[PDB]
Amino acid sequence: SDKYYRSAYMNVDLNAVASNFKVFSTLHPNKTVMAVVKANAYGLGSVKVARHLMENGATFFAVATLDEAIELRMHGITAKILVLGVLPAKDIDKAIQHRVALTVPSKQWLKEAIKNISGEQEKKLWLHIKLDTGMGRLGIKDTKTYQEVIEIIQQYEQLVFEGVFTHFACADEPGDMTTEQYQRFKDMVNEAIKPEYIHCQNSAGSLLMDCQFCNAIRPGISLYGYYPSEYVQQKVKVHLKPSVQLIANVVQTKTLQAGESVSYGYTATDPTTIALLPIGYADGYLRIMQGSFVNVNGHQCEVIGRVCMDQTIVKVPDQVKAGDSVILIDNHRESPQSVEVVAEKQHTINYEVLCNLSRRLPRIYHDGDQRFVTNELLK
């Protein structure tokens, strides 16, 4: 548990994350829940959330990069880990060494990966084949090439065909694409022997459909308590618990008299108090947040002037003083400080709001009565 010396931090509720995970376990009781903790678990912290989820029965995680995988491995995570991106061929030995499964996006990739397998790392190379079934980006599109890759894997005892998966492009919105990909997926996967894991659903897909054919699900943002779109949120009645709060303590206040002003980038008409927050755009509270409202001791206050790199200014009631807690992002969907309202202010989606949260912010994890802190600057 790291120390921190600036009252600006994120509260991460691990009980909320464990509830969300159960919601998914409960919705799909016959499937393996492959917890997606890529991008540092969407800003919350891969390691701490992964440890926590393991203590609650998670046996499989998905990340974006091998760096993310080795990071969980260097911190005691022993569950299975699948890398969703394409590993540079050179690094194949490190995946083998660290027991990390890998995505095969193409035949070419597999062929180049084999060539870089020196014999120093002799454990198995677990492989999940990615299939392209719709808005084709990454993955194998034709069944023939798919059989050929499987056929290649079967020449080497060291390579295991552990999974096959696909990703939906529009599942968080109305349309027949998703169901069209699902059928395309089965049509590809049926023309060859099935591997252990068959997974096609993200958060949207898992909350909206059952997909009996896909024995593993990959919930993401919803683990952290957020709906992947308004459509899904208004569609299903499952309850997800937001897990994040962004907080800052007022460090100083000044009273402007009518006629006096302050220049952070504001002139007062009546007597007004201003509070100085030690948080700014380098923490991920972007400049475009100007004019948004934040919660001070219960009341909505306006963010004035411009947001600076390390400071933010707020028009507040006179009684507010140094030490008062300010909630910039709250843990409730129907809140003027919800991740969604902030995303709207940033003209983006909830994913990016959490992702912008910089390393300069400590993560303070809550589990029942327990409290623990991670401060990257001092790690």
Next chain:
Amino acid sequence: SDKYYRSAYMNVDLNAVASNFKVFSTLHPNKTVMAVVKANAYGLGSVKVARHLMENGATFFAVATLDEAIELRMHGITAKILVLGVLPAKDIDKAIQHRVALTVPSKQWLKEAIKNISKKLWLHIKLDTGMGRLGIKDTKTYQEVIEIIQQYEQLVFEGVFTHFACADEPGDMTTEQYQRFKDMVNEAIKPEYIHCQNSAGSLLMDCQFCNAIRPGISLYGYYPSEYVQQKVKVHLKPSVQLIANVVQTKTLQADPTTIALLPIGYADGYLRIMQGSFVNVNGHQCEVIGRVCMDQTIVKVPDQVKAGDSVILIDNHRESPQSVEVVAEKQHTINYEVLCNLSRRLPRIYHDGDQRFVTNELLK
């Protein structure tokens, strides 16, 4: 040096940072250049920049938070360090234990802080000279704050400073505040460090009264604004490149085109709004199409592009269509934020004349 396992990274040119530093040193020959390495040296990695700058004459550094100062201390930085932000009383002792100078924003703050004192305390007093940016406004209180320092042998009045609000724009405001600053300072004993200029102030004025300067963004090769760029001769060398290699290509039908998939996305700081931008794939300007994803970006490319080819997303030139300022415009923000957005997920590859060194915070 750390390993890294995704072909996406930042090239941080320390030789460019050292030159920019010498330009300021040369421009203000007899001043201390208090190098601003706050916010992880605007995204470049403060530990490596500070260490590199100490090897080139840097004797004083400025950060935004005590965590930032302590981080430098943990890694061998021995020079002076001033926390520009306001540290509440609680943590003062740790600023004393670690030898970090602090900012006195008010008398309330000082008086109060004279209670977590339980080893010198180096204080730089902050004055509000007209724009409001919180600080002591009146000479009286200014004189009262010093007298208070004089009462404790452990408290040291090391400096006084102010922040100009509009040095990046034209007008007399800066000058008028520069005068107020003098008027206040000349009414009390003068401390060893007197500083009033940021990158802008440093590039545009001489300010002989102020014996120290605080360049920040410009140390890294960026002009604080176009107006400053169009008014000064001084040439700054941009120090950052953002690169990714194409992981796979795919050809589409219905105009038919080839798309390239890059292993970088908004979780790395290449924001969603970058859709519609251009990147440099082997000298070819290619558009970023479709939605930028958390981990991937798709670029419209000529059919001759292939897996493994390098893509420049942010280039180390100002004139370029991938300059930090062009990216800033696309992001409807300022160059400073483009740099701060770059995530911990990106490895920083430092260049120091064919000496390469990597920092991968994930394996660190």
